């Protein structure tokens, strides 16, 4: 996911190479680049 | 017996970017839960493009003020990461850490004086090869985009990225293709009663801007 | 040179006090009187301990120096059982400057709590006396607080007034040492006096302004002088900056219309470059010449070894708007020339300005010198035409003496300026006073003074035999400016073959002696006076020297003591003019 | 293209304003995780480490990106140069700890030993700066400058001693490098470049022969 | 907005029983995020409540805009303030808080006057800098243009390494409005201009009530 130019993968379970993430219950400034007004504002004219 | 192998010569040393994990020491600890915390960015270059930041004038100043006389000229400096206008940035702080660019790079001008100041603004880009203009009228044989103040008080250019190459160098050496890539030249056609207004100006990443080859010079 | 050393007038004050570390004249509206800055004399101030203050001198008839109340009062409080400020050691008289009725004392060390936090910064204070009226003038004391402002000013470390009535005031700690110049109005300084408000603002006050942090602890104001140098009337700012330029020092002019900025610059590195400034025109050509110390100056001998003897920059003002700038050195090693200078006005009368210059630390038993110099058409001569010394031992500090010195006051009305030299470290303050310039056109004629040993025309009495004889004839012609006697009664005397152990080969007829003297009494502006008398050449056969030329000296001398003054001021008589003159006489064959 | 100056709305142009064509572009090397996952060497002191990120020179690569964001989260990487057994003790733990072997202790391999540690903070993220109470956000009224400014650098700054990644203690540890794994940003910083004295920064770069 | 100088942007807000309604409008900016996280956590056992009567608008001083003030002037709020309404009453009551903020400040002077300022939502605000002053558009913000607007209206929800907060040590929010072009009074300008804010806590829960000496 993060650095690899190469892909050998793990001799151990993920339960012990990294920590585990919990559920409770690329988001912001990729949603806000991405409502980004590209077009034109005024009335083009030629 | 047992399985043969030959242990390499050149293999195995650190390498401090190499893709390769480590070897674990303490396991099964779960993380308390962080999903949806607000603003998580995954991409330098996505908070690049939806927030410019300011320029950088004689003076130390965001903004440049109309001046009133036979010169016409508001701001002319190269077009370069690694300028002093562009110091200020966080395109320019964060493109300090890569080799080579590409793409586009968006000038925002708000203009700020009251509302019977009026004035009338020309940025037109000089590509390297002859020395940059020094009027608007030899500059309007150029690239160039013209607006005058309103009801809309932003205006945005897009400074294209004509070049030999596919990509330019962020840094700068001496007198060289990849680090002059050409001028970026703001004039003022016209003003009416807008003696001592300002025009703050900020800078942010095109649709197309990219930034690769990772490096380290120093320098927060 | 004309300054009177037999009996110079001696002030003192109590032991500690440093009776002498700043002195000024008061002339006010028709008393004269001296001030003498002591900053660590006791107080009956309620509960002040040191407070220091200025001592009036009474320079008519006796040595009394009566204290001067600017303030009586203790430490004001800003609420219940919380001090305002701490007037405890506030070195007040540290700096005293006076014009007319107006006098001007400082308290460089006076502390001051904020009016919002405890602390205690030194911004200093004064007091100004108009007569009957004084107030408070402490513009370093604001609302700009604590280092980076003015809370660490120490406003009144140097001050001056104009002619336009307008007070300059430095303080070297201003913005992280940056110094400050502050520029009041001797009019808002009273009318704008408040005794509730102890942050006043002035509506025409100059400052200098805070500046970048690379100009920080350069001492601005640690020493100022005022003097026109734009040609507009006004006179202008001149403050040494002796941190200034990484410890090169510097010295700044600012317009004294508006505070705007020439600037000197120091040729070695720590020699304190404008510990000390002074503007004067020292060559009558009524433009302000800027002078600038820096006792700690090193020079280099024939042996080529570094030695610490101070040194002046004289710059004189030239219309060009350029500095003819002179450097002068000190005498003695260590003893820090040009740690005060002091104008003078034009001492001797000649039409020129003079001013003096002390090496605190010098002279025999670390005493004390002041040197006295004149100005010329060329500049200031650079030879000093009197030393002063001083004549007190040391106790702990050095006597000091010429730490600090005023001049250029006529105090007596003899016509002639005066000048006070304080030796604080003795507690001791000392007045000079300038004894009358005396011009003299003395004349010597001989004729003939080709002598014919046959002419023989003289007879002589008593002998039938005549000799060959001739006449000699001497003048005197006297005038001086100021107060002195209308008659001058001169001792002349006269000999002939002044060159001859050897046989004098003149005599006078009427005494058959080469010497003669003559009581002759002139007057002062009046007309020249003229004796003559007849002298002889001795016969051929009694001497075989006769291709050596007869010279005629004549000398003069003054009766100084018949020529005092109701004090006992005795004249003195003019600088490189000759106290005797000679003529020749030659033999023919 | 004009628009409202003050919406804060982000307005992108491009090229096709006045003719041109906006081209594709590869972003893998702006990549957050991308680009952290780096070695990051750190000064270390003789024997005791405690494994803080804030510990990283600012102005390296790792060092600015990362307090180029508030919040942040990350698996620990770390390579050691170190003269007997290093041991490690997580987040929370006492210092007499450092000195019993049953916590995770790596014995001495030539040249150097590398670990992955998890994260072991009680916090659901850490942080690169944490008002705790400081500025008031008033211009710092103007107090501070000669001798105690070096002193006072660090003064209005500081963190909670639970951010970290626990502590590592060997006989002499030479030689520390930090990797973060995983790593999430969150809310982004100011990032600054060299000040230039000239118009422009100008350097020395690698010179080939054409 | 409108064909003249006069201006038609109307936008009113409704926090409680307090609105406020403005005329020259720009726009709400969302910083961070639209909605909340998760309330209900494992760190404080289901014993949290919310408190609807403390999510209303409270009005307080910023600074004098006047023509002197040049580029880079700040003013800091820390973010909880001290409140003397319902709210202040919950950092008394309870120990741990977290809320959103609504922030809405105000700079009114007539639009013949030039200048510009920034308005900012900075979180974790523990010291700032001339240069970083530049960058200070990378937070959620909105320009104050007087020939334009005269209200910044910025809704910003709560961020921490934890998931409530202790208020009483710790600010997690800072809001800073900065000078980016001096203020102008050409001819008909209004002299100076005051600048206030009119903030309102949002979606606000507290959690473990201390005792009381009442
Ligand atoms: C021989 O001895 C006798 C006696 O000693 C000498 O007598 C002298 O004659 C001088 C010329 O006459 C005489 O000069 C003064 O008196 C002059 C009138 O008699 C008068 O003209 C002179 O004024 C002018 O004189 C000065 C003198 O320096 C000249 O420089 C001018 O050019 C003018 O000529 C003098 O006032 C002198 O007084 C007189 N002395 C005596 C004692 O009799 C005589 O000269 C000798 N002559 C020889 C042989 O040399
Ligand atoms: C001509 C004559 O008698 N000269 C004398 C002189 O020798 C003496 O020195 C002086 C003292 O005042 O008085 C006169
Ligand atoms: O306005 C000019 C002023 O701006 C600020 C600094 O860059 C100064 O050096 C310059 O003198
Ligand atoms: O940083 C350089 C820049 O700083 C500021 C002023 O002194 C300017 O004139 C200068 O060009
Ligand atoms: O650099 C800005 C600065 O420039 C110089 C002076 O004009 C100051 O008054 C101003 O603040
Ligand atoms: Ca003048
Ligand atoms: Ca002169
Ligand atoms: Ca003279
Ligand atoms: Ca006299």
Known sequence: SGNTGSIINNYYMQQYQNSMDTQLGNDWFSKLASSAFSGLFGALLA | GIFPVACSDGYGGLVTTDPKTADPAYGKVFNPPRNMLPGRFTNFLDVAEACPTFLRFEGDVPYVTTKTDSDRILAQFDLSLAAKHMSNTFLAGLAQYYTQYSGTINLHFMFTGPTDAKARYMIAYAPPGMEPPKTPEAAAHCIHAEWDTGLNSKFTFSIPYLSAADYAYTASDTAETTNVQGWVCLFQITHGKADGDALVVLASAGKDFELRLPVDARTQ | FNLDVDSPAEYSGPEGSYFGFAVDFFVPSSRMFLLVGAPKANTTQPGIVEGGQVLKCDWSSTRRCQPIEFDATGNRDYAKDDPLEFKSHQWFGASVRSKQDKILACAPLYHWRTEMKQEREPVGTCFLQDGTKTVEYAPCRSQDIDADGQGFCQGGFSIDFTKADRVLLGGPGSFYWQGQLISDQVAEIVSKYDPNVYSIKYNNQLATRTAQAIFDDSYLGYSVAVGDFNGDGIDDFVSGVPRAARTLGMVYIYDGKNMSSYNFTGEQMAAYFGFSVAATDINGDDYADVF???????????????????????????????????????????????????????????????????????????????????????????????????????????????????????????????????????????????????????????????????????????????????????????????????????????????????????????????????????????????????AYLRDESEFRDKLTPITIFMEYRLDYRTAADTTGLQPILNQFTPANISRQAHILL | ?????????????????????????????????????????????????????????????????????????????????????????????????????????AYHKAPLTRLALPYTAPHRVLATAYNGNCKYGESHTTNVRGDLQVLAQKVARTLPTSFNYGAIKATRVTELLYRMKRAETYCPRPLLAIHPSEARHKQKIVAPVK | ???????????????????????????????????????????????????????????????????????????????????????????????????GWDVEVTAVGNQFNGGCLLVAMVPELCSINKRELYQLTLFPHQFINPRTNMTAHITVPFVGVNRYDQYKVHKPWTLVVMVVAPLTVNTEGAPQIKVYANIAPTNVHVAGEFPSKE
């Not at chain 4, 405690?50 to 770390?78: K, S």
Request: hydrophobic fraction near 35%; charged fraction near 20%; include cysteine.
């Open chain 3, 292 to 534: 600038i110390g820096a006792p700690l100056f090193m020079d280099r001998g024939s042996d080529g070894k570094l030695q610490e003897v101070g040194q002046v920059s004289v710059s004189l003002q030239r219309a060009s708007g350029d500095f003819q700038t002179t450097k002068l050195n000190g005498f003695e090693v260590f003893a820090r020339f040009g740690s005060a200078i002091a104008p003078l006005g034009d001492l001797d009368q000649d039409g020129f300005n003079d001013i003096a210059i002390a090496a605190p630390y010098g002279g025999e038993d670390k005493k004390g010198i002041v040197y006295i110099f004149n100005g010329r058409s060329t500049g200031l001569n650079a030879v000093p035409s009197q030393i002063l010394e001083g004549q007190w031992a040391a106790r702990s500090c050095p006597p000091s003496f010429g730490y600090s010195m005023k001049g250029a006051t006529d105090i007596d009305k003899n016509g002639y300026p005066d000048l006070i030299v304080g030796a604080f470290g003795v507690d001791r303050a000392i007045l000079y006073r300038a004894r009358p310039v005396i011009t003299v056109n003395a004349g010597l004629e001989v004729y003939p003074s080709i002598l014919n040993q046959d002419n023989k025309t003289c007879s002589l009495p008593g002998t039938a035999l005549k000799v060959s004889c001739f006449n000699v004839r001497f003048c005197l012609k006297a005038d001086g400016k100021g107060v002195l006697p209308r008659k001058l009664n001169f001792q002349v005397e006269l000999l002939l073959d002044k060159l001859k152990g050897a046989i004098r080969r003149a005599l006078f007829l009427y005494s058959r002696s080469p010497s003669h003297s003559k009581n002759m009494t002139i007057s002062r502006g009046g007309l020249m006076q003229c004796e003559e008398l007849i």
């Open chain 4, 1 to 105: 293209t004009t628009s409202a100056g003050e919406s804060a709305d982000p307005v992108t142009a491009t090229v096709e304003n006045y003719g041109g064509e906006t081209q594709v572009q590869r972003r893998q090397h702006t990549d957050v995780s991308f680009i952290l996952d780096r070695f990051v060497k750190v000064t270390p002191k003789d024997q005791i480490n405690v494994l803080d990120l804030m510990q990283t020179p600012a102005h390296t690569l790792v060092g600015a990106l990362l307090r180029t964001a508030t919040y942040y989260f990350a698996d620990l990487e770390v390579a050691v140069k170190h003269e007997g057994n290093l041991t490690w003790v997580p987040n929370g733990a006492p210092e007499t700890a450092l000195d019993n072997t049953t916590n995770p202790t």
């Open chain 5, 1 to 99: 907005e409108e064909t003249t100088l006069l201006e038609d942007r109307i936008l009113t807000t409704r926090n409680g029983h307090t609105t406020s309604t403005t005329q020259s409008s720009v726009g709400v900016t969302y910083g961070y995020a639209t909605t909340e996280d998760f309330v209900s956590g494992p760190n404080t056992s289901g014993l949290e409540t919310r408190v609807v009567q403390a999510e209303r608008f409270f009005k307080t001083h910023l600074f004098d805009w006047v023509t002197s003030d040049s580029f880079g002037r700040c003013h800091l709020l820390e973010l909880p303030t001290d409140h003397k309404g319902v709210y202040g009453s919950l950092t008394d009551s309870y120990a741990y808080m977290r809320n």
